[PDB]
């Protein structure tokens, strides 16, 4: 069908019945394997934020986005999929100053608001209304705040599973430093946990960034905070870890 597939879909969203949208994809997007269907199908979220009413977006999201609940036509929508122009549905939503939608997108769990398009622009830069930018900028502030507290809590409880959950989220990888000092202490998380001689947690930290060369505010880098067979386990652990970093510096 080539591009009238885009018209079929851009029309189905424009009406506003999520059943009616399914009924179109069910009988008009066959065969689902041919790549012209799968390409215009995976633009569905960019198309919803332009022409579809609000409730159709929620119904599209809460059904097919970042979910393994077998869905419908085995359709799985990536919330941060990228245009031919590199944009995400959050980009278009912002660009068109459709603010009530920029809100609902930033409240989703897998939203990545730090994606760069082809022009090398964040989704926040596309809008024209400052009122929309401010709410966008405010929401990043609240997310980084709430997530940084979940990070601290996860370390204090030694919730290993929750830590791998937070560093996996790419939006977090962009807005979260595993090194940063505690403001009124030394103190990277490596120092804090070398001092509790917690070998299992230090090994975990060494694998997820956490460089062993960062001093605290007393010059002491981690290795210099050292039965006693637990001590020599850390001391040999860091020795092996620093030797890996000094292989990139070939000269």
């Amino acid at each position: 069908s080539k591009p009238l597939l885009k018209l079929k879909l851009l029309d189905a969203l424009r009406q506003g019945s999520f059943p009616n949208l399914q009924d179109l994809l069910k009988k008009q997007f066959q065969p689902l394997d041919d790549p012209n269907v799968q390409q215009v199908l995976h633009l569905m979220l960019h198309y919803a934020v332009q022409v579809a009413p609000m409730a159709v977006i929620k119904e599209i999201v809460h059904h097919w986005v970042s979910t393994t609940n077998t869905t419908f036509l085995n359709i799985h929508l990536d919330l941060n999929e990228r245009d031919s122009n590199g944009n995400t549905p959050l980009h278009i939503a912002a660009y068109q100053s459709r603010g009530d939608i920029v809100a609902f997108l930033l409240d989703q769990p897998t939203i990545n608001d730090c994606v760069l398009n082809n022009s090398h622009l964040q989704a926040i830069e596309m809008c024209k209304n400052l009122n929309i930018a401010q709410m966008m900028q405010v929401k990043r502030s609240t997310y980084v705040a709430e997530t940084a507290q979940e990070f601290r809590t996860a370390f204090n409880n030694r919730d290993f599973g929750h830590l791998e959950s937070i560093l996996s989220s790419p939006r977090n990888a962009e807005l979260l430093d595993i090194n940063g000092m505690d403001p009124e202490t030394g103190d990277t998380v490596l120092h804090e946990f070398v001092k509790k001689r917690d070998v299992i947690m230090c090994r975990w930290l060494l694998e997820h960034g956490a460089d062993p060369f960062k001093r605290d505010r007393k010059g002491k880098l981690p290795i210099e905070l050292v039965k006693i067979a637990i001590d020599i386990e850390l001391k040999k652990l860091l020795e092996r870890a620093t030797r890996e970093q000094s292989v990139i510096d070939v000269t």
Binding site: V144, A145, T147, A148, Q149, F151, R152, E174, L175, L176, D177, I178, G180, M181, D182, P183, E184
Partner: peptide, 16 residues
């Protein structure tokens, strides 16, 4: 004290 407990964690694990 200076910083509370959560805004303490924003300075530590936040990236500006």
């Amino acid at each position: 004290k200076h910083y509370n407990d959560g805004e303490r964690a924003v300075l530590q694990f936040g990236k500006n």
